[PDB]
Amino acid sequence: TKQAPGVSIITAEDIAKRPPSNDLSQIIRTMPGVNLTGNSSSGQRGNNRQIDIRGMGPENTLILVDGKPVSSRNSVRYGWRGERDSRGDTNWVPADQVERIEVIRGPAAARYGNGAAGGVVNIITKQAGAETHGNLSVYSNFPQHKAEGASERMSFGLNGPLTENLSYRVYGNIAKTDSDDWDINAGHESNRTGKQAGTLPAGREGVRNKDIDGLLSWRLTPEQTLEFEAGFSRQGNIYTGDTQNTNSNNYVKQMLGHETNRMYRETYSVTHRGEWDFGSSLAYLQYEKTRNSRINEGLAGGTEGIFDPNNAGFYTATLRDLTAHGEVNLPLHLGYEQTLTLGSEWTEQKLDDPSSNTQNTEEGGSIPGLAGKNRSSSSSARIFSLFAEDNIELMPGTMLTPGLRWDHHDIVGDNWSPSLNLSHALTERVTLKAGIARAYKAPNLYQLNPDYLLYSRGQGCYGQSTSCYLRGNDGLKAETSVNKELGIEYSHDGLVAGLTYFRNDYKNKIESGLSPVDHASGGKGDYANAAIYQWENVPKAVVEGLEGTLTLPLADGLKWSNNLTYMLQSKNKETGDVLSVTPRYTLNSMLDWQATDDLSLQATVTWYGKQKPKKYDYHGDRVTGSANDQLSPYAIAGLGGTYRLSKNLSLGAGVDNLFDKRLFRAGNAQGVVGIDGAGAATYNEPGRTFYTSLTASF
């Protein structure tokens, strides 16, 4: 089945029956335990939501492609409120070249180490066969309301042998998601007065994709395979007025409808795969090089994350991420029947960011140990990792899986991430699963860097109205989380019913500090001698909730599927405010009718629970008026079909949001001067949208 406790598979067949507009987040987010949220609670960059596992935030969701990490978003400035102006890393592989997606949540994900505290999403590509196969896939949607951006997508794939011990697969994708109109949120915006009169919270950013992957597999012996692949991808946006605080200037408006960020992603990988008597071997080298070219932004207060008109033009942030991995797998025949897995991992993240480290000290006064001008652009961290998994069959149908992961971070120090995963046949139809692991989060290179410096004149300073600096802190501890889960599942003749309780106890969550550690000296007027805060480790936070699934075969041709997320608790135990904003629950419901040998029909509903905003502003004071606004529970319904014309040609057509339930970004969560808050109303929900698709394949 596609749902066990803690784990979800999405197949190629699922991707075809609920086609995504462009980004995979659309379908990945319908799994149990998965939400589409920002990383903290500000609502900043709120139309740029990313996959979130069990409310742990999307920085704790590790994205792999064919088991190789994607780190491209680590090239985008990490802001005061824990958001990046990033669309995330689930849009690098085109939907129709994906074989399957694996979602691994909680204690079962800890063993993947750094940034798996939420879980792992592994996007797996279609491979060459015994003969040559290929496909040509085209998808095109059509919103009811013209304001909302339509999406168009064309991908091929082409694979096969070249010799009897040489395979290849290649694909290429060209896609575009038009931006929402600059004015989609007009009449829905928060109250905006004085200097900020006329300002708008933005709709969805558009994106243009160009993806090209080539792979050669070479099985130079019976039990010895060697893979080389290169990836070239490029996303350029279509700008539609988005700024961190929803403030505006002239440069912003000049750029409406233009490309204001381009991400070039280049991946080369060498992968050796081994299979013999004693067991199985795997090792890879990945070089990921990300170029994040975008218009210079300010780094101070309300100018944080708006185009800087004094320093017009593009800069380029460069991320060179180097990953090498070794594992073996040993079948052991002892007192207890078991399989042992032994691994090292080595990673290097080099970040060149010529823009983020340029905030100067002329106004808030100078900071002992921090040069005001021409600070380094450079950040790096190396983690070295050893791990062993023992997959022990006590008595058939029972597995006990203990593993130790140890990591040496060359700044933060040593991490010990132990794990234990039990699965228990109570009956041939029923399985109990328990897991308790301590997962691992290395600070990102922004949090870690004493050259990385934000400034506010007060509005953004915790527990005061005076000027303050926020500073990077190489003294930080890693974030660790003891992810507990207890779950039960009945599964028989395609009848599946399961419910999991999960609690992650979250230690040292890194976050903009609450107490000044220091005060700068000098500067201008009432702003002089500003307070200095760092990125602090929050001692304790907790997330808690329920994952459910229920699958009933109504008749032979008819399948009724349901996935449930229910989020019980999400609490920074220091401030008592929420970590993210999720829907209280999410129920995704598919009816799948195989009407004929050739015609398949799909009805879907998603129910979203209530969504409540943070209680406290940047000051730590209680928010008031429209900053308290909640989003009422709502549902989105859809019909679709796929009519197979032959073995070589299939056609799809359907409607997302049948009943045209629409939501509009009113702005960020809290009030600032001249821009009232928008509470939980921080994203655009698209209206009725027709779509059509065509797949030709040998």
Ligand SMILES: C#CCNC(=O)[C@H](CCCCNC(=O)c1cccc(O)c1O)NC(=O)c1cccc(O)c1O
């Ligand atoms: C009017 C006026 C004063 N200056 C400005 O027009 C601009 C825009 C500020 C308007 C909206 N403010 C915020 O959303 C905000 C968010 C986080 C922290 C904050 O401090 C915020 O203000 N700011 C600045 O030029 C500025 C410069 C240095 C330090 C600051 O805090 C600034 O706001």
Ligand SMILES: [Fe+3]
């Ligand atoms: Fe300000």
